[PDB]
Design a protein around this ligand. Structure first.
Ligand SMILES: [Mg+2]
Ligand SMILES: [Mg+2]
Ligand SMILES: [Mg+2]
Ligand SMILES: [Mg+2]
Ligand SMILES: [Mg+2]
Ligand SMILES: [Mg+2]
Ligand SMILES: [Mg+2]
Ligand SMILES: [Mg+2]
Ligand SMILES: [Mg+2]
Ligand SMILES: [Mg+2]
Ligand SMILES: [Mg+2]
Ligand SMILES: [Mg+2]
Ligand SMILES: [Mg+2]
Ligand SMILES: [Mg+2]
Ligand SMILES: [Mg+2]
Ligand SMILES: [Mg+2]
Ligand SMILES: [Mg+2]
Lengths: 258, 171, 184, 134
RNA sequence: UAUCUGGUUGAUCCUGCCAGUAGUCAUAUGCUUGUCUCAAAGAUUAAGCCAUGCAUGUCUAAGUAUAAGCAAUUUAUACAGUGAAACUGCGAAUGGCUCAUUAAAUCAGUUAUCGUUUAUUUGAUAGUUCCUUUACUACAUGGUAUAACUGUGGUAAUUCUAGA
RNA sequence: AUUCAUAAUAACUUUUCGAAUCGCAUGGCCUUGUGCUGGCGAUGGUUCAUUCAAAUUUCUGCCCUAUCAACUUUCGAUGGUAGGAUAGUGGCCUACCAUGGUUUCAACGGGUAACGGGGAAUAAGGGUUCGAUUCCGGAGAGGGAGCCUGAGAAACGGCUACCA
C-alpha cells in the first residue's frame, strides 16, 4: 500500500507479451494511458521483441527521441507508452504502418497495413452521456471523447475514427449477424458473426458467437468487439482470421508446409 | 557562549527550546513541511553572551575609523525593468535597454561589462505570444458555435424524418 | 528477484536395496554395455516409468478422445524417432511393455560398438569420452546420445581428431620427436 | 588463415537507426579464436562502406571449434555510428578513449561530503582558516 | 510406480507395538572430494544490539545566473556558448528487507460504489471578470521580499546559524 | 432501478478558475508605423471522461482445545431518528429512544514452536505433512502514541514526546 506502485516484476506481466521469465528481474510497466495495464503492447516490448528493430532498452529510447515512432498520428515519445487494440503504430521512416490485432492465440501480432487505410481506427463506444452545457459525447474503448455524435449511436456500438480530427466518419450498430471480434475472455482472438444475446437483467449480459466454420461459443458482452457486417469487414484481419483451429489439426496443417 | 543565537524579542534571558518551522529564523529546514526542536537564547541581554550584534541608527560626532570613514558599494544593480525605472525615476518610457548598470571585468587583456538582463521587459516576442493566445480563444469559440449549429440542424432533420415517418403510419 | 530455475531429478532408487534377483541383473546391464554406475540403469527406468505412466493414462481414456489421440500420436512418434520402438508396434499397447534395455541399446555407447570402429564397448566408452566422435558434423563426448535413426550413418570420427586425419596425434608427435633427435 | 568464409544470416535493414542487423556466421576449419577485430574489415569490403562503420559482438564458439555465431552491425557512415554505438564498444575499436573517473566508491564519498556544505563554501573556507589561526 | 521383512513360544492361530526398508526444494553434522552447467544461503534461537562505509536525487532548445567562474566575441551595449551555487518544479509514499502481530482478522475465489477520493497519462473542455464596472486603469504587461553572493562573528562539537 | 446525466429560477461565497510564463522560426499586408496579422512547440490551468490506483463492501471457505457454556450491553452491545465528522456509506462519534445482537449447525474464551494464498514432499485410489522464503495480497522499521508536507504516509535512510 502507501501509494501507487511504479514497478512491475517479471512473472507478473500479462502472459501475451511473451517476455522470457529469465534475463531480468523486471518487465516494462505500462504508463497510464488510453488502455489498461494488462491489455497493453507497450512500445519497448513491441520495438525490441516483436520487430527486433532495437536490441537494448537504451536504443529503444533513442528511436523515440528522434520522433520516428508515432502512435495514432501523434509522436508519443514514451518508452512504455501503452498501445492497445487497433492502435495504429505508424513509422514515418521505412514507410510501414502496423495495426495492433489479436492473433488466434490471443497474443499481439504484427499486422502491416497500407498507408491508405492506416489513417483510421475503429472504436467500441463504452458510455454515452451528456457533457456540460448539454453537449452529448461518446467514449471509445481507448478513452477518446467525441462531442456531437450521431443520435442513433448507442452503447456497445463501434465507431470509425478519422484519426486526423476528433470527429467520426462511420459507425456500426450492435445487432445480430454483425461481424464481431473477441477482445478478452477464453476465446480471445476470434471473429464470430454474432447470432444472439441474452439480456440477464442485473449484470453480465451474455452473447452467443458462431465461427465461420459453424463453431459456436459464448463470451461475455464486455469481450465482444463488433468490427462490421457479416462478410466484408472494415479492417484487415490478420493471418488465421480468428478460427480457433484445433491442436489436432494444427500439427496436420503445419506438417503440410515444412 | 556556546553559540546559541537569540530569538527576536521573545522572552526569558535564559536558554529555552522551541519547535522551529519555515519562515522562522534560527532554523533552516532540510525537508518540505519539516519542523524541528532547537535550543534558542532569549532576547534580554545578559552577562552570559559572547557576542552582541549592534547597528548604528544615528551617527555621533567622532569618526570611527572602520565604520564611518570607509564605504563599500552595493553588490548588484537592478535587474527588472521597473526596478531600474524607480532607481532613476525619470519616466515610463525611459527605454532602460541602454540604462543597465554594467560591471567591467578584465579576464585578460580583453575587457567586457556584461550588463546582466532585464526581466519583464516588453519584447515583440512577448507581444506575439499574447496575440497567439488571444486569437486562439476566438478561433476555438468560432468552431464551437458552428459545431453545435451543425448538430442542431442534423437533429432537426432527424426529428423531421421521424415526424414524417409516423405521419405515414396510422393511415 | 529473478524467476527461479526449474530443476528435476532423473532417477529413482529401488525400494529393496539388497535383492539378488535384481542385484545381478543390474550388473548384467552394466556388464556388456560399459556403464560405471547403477544410476545409468536407474536413470533409464525413471522415464521408462514416466512413459508407461503416460501410456496407462491414455488407455484409460475413451477411444477417439482427442486428448488420447493427440498425446498418443506424439508419444508413439517420439519414441519411434528415437528408435526404442519398432515401426510395427505403433498401437499404443506395445509401448507399455517395450523393454528395460531397449532404451539403453540406442545410446551412443552401443552405436559406436554396433557400427564397427570400436571392437569392444569398453573401447568405445573411451572413444566417445576422448572426443573422437562426430554424430553429425559436431563433436560429441556424451556416451548417452540416443541416436535418432536419422544419424546412424552419420557417426564418423571428428575431422579435427586423429583416426580421421588432419593431425597425426598428440602422443605420436613427441614419439617421433626422440626419433629425429636420436638419429642426429 | 584458411577458408575464413565469413557469412551473414538473417539480415534485416534497420533504417530507424540507419543500420543493417545480421548474424555473423563464421566457418573457420583448422582455425580458432576468429579475432573479431579482424571481422571488421572482412565485413567492411563486403558492404564496401568502411572499416569504422561496422561493429561485431557475441561470437560464442560452438562445441569443438571450427564454427562461430555472433551478431554484427554495419552503419551507413561513421557519423551515426559514433552517435548510436555504445561508448564501451567504441573504446574497444579505438574510436574513443577511456574517460578518467574515480572509482564508484570515491564518487559516493564526494557527493556525501558536498551535502554537508550549503552554498559555494568559499565563505566557510576563509572562516575556518580565520578560526584555525586563533 | 496397489510388494513388505525380523522380534513374546518347546513348537503355535494373532489388529500388537518395536525394529528394519525407500523418499524429502527437511534441516544439522561427520568423513571424503577430479571436471562442466546450475544454484539456495543469519528463517527457526534473539522483530537481539550495532562501529564504519555506501544504499535518493534530478534539467532540456524551451522557469530564474552580473560566479567579483571558464573560453570564444565580432550573432548582439541588456541577455542569449558552457556553467559551480542557490531559488523554483518534480521525486523521495517506488524499490528493498523481515514475518513480530494477526484465527471471520489477513487471505482466496467472487460481487458493489446509484456509497467515495484519484497526483501522473490520454481525449475533450472557459469570447462573458475594467465592480456606482463614462477616467477607477500599465494592458505594447504591474508590486515585494529573498536565496545564492560580499562583509562582520559565536562556540569543543552537528547537513547549527546571527547581524549588516 | 434513482432525487441520474443535463438544463431552468432565486439568491450565496471570507471568492476558485478563466495564461502579466518560456524556446525556435521568422513569414505576409498596406495609410512603412518598431503598425496590423502570423507557425512549430514547452509549461501551467477549471470541469468531464480515461488510465495508473485507493478506500469501503457481497457470498462461501481456516489449525487445536468444553480441564472454555453461555457471551455482549458499567462508559456502544443490537437497531431507530437527528446531528457532527469523513473523500465518502456506516455507532465512526454525540443526544434521545427501544431492548436488543451471537450461541451445541461449537458462540465466547484459551493455545498456536500461526502472516494468508499461488505452491512443496510423499502418495494405486482416498489421504497425510509442510508452505519464514524468487509471484500476489497484508503488516512492521526498538515498543507505543501523535503529526507536518504532499495526490498519495499515521512514513520512520520525515519530525515530536514517553518508555528501553
Ligand atoms: Mg514504466
Ligand atoms: Mg496402502
Ligand atoms: Mg504365548
Ligand atoms: Mg525363541
Ligand atoms: Mg488394530
Ligand atoms: Mg519406523
Ligand atoms: Mg514496499
Ligand atoms: Mg514465526
Ligand atoms: Mg487533460
Ligand atoms: Mg447517520
Ligand atoms: Mg443511528
Ligand atoms: Mg508468529
Ligand atoms: Mg511481499
Ligand atoms: Mg507502515
Ligand atoms: Mg532490531
Ligand atoms: Mg511510524
Ligand atoms: Mg535504516
Amino acid at each position: 500500500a502507501r501509494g501507487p506502485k511504479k514497478h512491475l516484476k517479471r512473472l507478473a506481466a500479462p502472459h501475451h507479451w511473451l517476455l522470457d521469465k529469465l534475463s531480468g528481474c523486471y518487465a516494462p510497466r505500462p504508463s497510464a494511458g488510453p488502455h489498461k495495464l494488462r491489455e497493453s503492447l507497450p512500445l519497448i516490448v513491441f520495438l525490441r521483441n516483436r520487430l527486433k528493430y532495437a536490441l537494448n532498452g537504451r536504443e529503444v529510447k533513442a528511436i523515440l527521441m528522434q520522433r520516428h515512432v508515432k502512435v495514432d498520428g501523434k509522436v508519443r515519445t514514451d518508452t512504455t507508452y501503452p498501445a492497445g487494440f487497433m492502435d495504429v503504430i505508424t513509422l514515418d521512416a521505412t514507410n510501414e504502418n502496423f495495426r495492433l490485432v489479436y492473433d488466434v492465440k490471443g497474443r499481439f501480432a504484427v499486422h502491416r497495413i497500407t498507408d491508405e487505410e492506416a489513417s483510421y481506427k475503429l472504436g467500441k463506444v463504452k458510455k454515452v452521456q451528456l457533457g456540460k452545457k448539454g453537449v452529448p459525447y461518446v467514449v471509445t474503448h481507448d478513452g477518446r471523447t467525441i462531442r456531437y455524435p450521431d443520435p442513433n449511436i448507442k452503447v456497445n456500438d463501434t465507431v470509425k475514427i478519422d484519426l486526423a480530427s476528433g470527429k467520426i466518419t462511420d459507425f456500426i450498430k450492435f445487432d445480430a449477424g454483425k461481424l464481431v471480434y473477441v477482445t478478452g475472455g477464453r476465446n480471445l482472438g476470434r471473429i464470430g458473426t454474432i447470432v444472439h444475446k441474452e439480456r440477464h437483467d442485473g449484470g453480465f449480459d451474455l452473447v452467443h458467437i458462431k465461427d465461420s466454420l459453424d463453431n459456436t461459443f459464448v463470451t461475455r458482452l464486455n469481450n465482444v468487439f463488433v468490427i462490421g457486417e457479416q462478410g466484408k469487414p472494415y479492417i484487415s484481419l490478420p493471418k488465421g482470421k480468428g478460427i480457433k483451429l484445433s491442436i489436432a489439426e494444427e500439427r496436420d496443417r503445419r506438417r503440410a508446409q515444412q | 557562549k556556546q553559540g546559541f543565537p537569540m530569538k527576536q524579542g521573545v522572552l526569558l534571558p535564559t536558554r529555552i527550546k522551541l519547535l522551529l518551522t519555515k519562515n522562522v529564523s534560527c532554523y533552516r529546514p532540510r525537508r518540505d513541511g519539516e519542523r524541528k526542536r532547537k535550543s534558542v537564547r532569549g532576547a534580554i541581554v545578559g552577562p552570559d553572551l559572547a557576542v552582541l550584534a549592534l547597528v548604528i541608527v544615528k551617527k555621533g560626532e567622532q569618526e570611527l575609523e572602520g565604520l564611518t570613514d570607509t564605504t563599500v558599494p552595493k553588490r548588484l544593480g537592478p535587474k527588472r525593468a521597473n526596478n531600474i525605472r524607480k532607481f532613476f525615476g525619470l519616466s515610463k518610457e525611459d527605454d532602460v535597454r541602454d540604462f543597465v548598470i554594467r560591471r567591467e571585468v578584465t579576464k585578460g587583456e580583453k575587457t567586457y561589462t556584461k550588463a546582466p538582463k532585464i526581466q519583464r521587459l516588453v519584447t515583440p516576442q512577448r507581444l506575439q505570444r499574447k496575440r497567439h493566445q488571444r486569437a486562439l480563444k476566438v478561433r476555438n469559440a468560432q468552431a464551437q458555435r458552428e459545431a453545435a449549429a451543425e448538430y442542431a440542424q442534423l437533429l432537426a432533420k432527424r426529428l423531421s424524418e421521424r415526424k414524417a415517418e409516423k405521419a405515414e403510419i396510422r393511415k | 528477484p529473478r524467476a527461479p530455475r526449474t530443476y528435476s531429478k532423473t532417477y529413482s532408487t529401488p525400494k529393496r536395496p539388497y535383492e539378488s534377483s535384481r542385484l545381478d541383473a543390474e550388473l548384467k546391464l552394466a556388464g556388456e554395455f560399459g556403464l560405471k554406475n547403477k544410476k545409468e540403469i536407474y536413470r533409464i527406468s525413471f522415464q521408462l516409468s514416466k512413459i508407461r505412466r503416460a501410456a496407462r493414462d491414455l488407455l484409460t481414456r475413451d477411444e477417439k478422445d482427442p486428448k488420447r489421440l493427440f498425446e498418443g500420436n506424439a508419444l508413439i512418434r517420439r519414441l519411434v524417432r528415437v528408435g526404442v520402438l519398432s515401426e510395427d508396434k505403433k498401437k499404443l499397447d506395445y509401448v507399455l511393455a517395450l523393454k528395460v534395455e531397449d532404451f539403453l541399446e540406442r545410446r551412443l555407447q552401443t552405436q559406436v560398438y554396433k557400427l564397427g570402429l570400436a571392437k569392444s564397448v569398453h573401447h568405445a566408452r573411451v572413444l566417445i569420452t576422448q572426443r573422437h566422435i562426430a554424430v553429425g558434423k559436431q563433436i560429441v563426448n556424451i556416451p548417452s546420445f540416443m541416436v535418432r535413426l536419422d544419424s546412424e550413418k552419420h557417426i564418423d570420427f571428428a575431422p579435427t581428431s586423429p583416426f580421421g586425419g588432419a593431425r597425426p596425434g598428440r602422443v605420436a608427435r613427441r614419439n617421433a620427436a626422440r626419433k629425429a633427435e636420436a638419429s642426429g | 588463415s584458411d577458408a575464413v568464409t565469413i557469412r551473414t544470416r538473417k539480415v534485416i535493414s534497420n533504417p530507424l537507426l540507419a543500420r543493417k542487423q545480421f548474424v555473423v556466421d563464421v566457418l573457420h576449419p583448422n582455425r580458432a579464436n576468429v579475432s573479431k577485430d579482424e571481422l571488421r574489415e572482412k565485413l567492411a569490403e563486403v558492404y564496401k562502406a568502411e572499416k569504422d562503420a561496422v561493429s561485431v559482438f557475441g561470437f560464442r564458439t560452438q562445441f569443438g571449434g571450427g564454427k562461430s555465431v555472433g551478431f554484427g552491425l554495419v552503419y551507413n557512415s561513421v557519423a551515426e555510428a559514433k552517435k548510436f554505438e555504445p561508448t564501451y564498444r567504441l573504446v574497444r575499436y579505438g574510436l574513443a578513449e577511456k574517460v578518467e573517473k574515480a572509482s564508484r566508491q570515491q564518487r559516493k564519498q564526494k557527493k556525501n561530503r558536498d551535502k554537508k556544505i550549503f552554498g559555494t563554501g568559499k565563505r566557510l573556507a576563509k572562516k575556518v582558516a580565520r578560526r584555525n589561526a586563533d
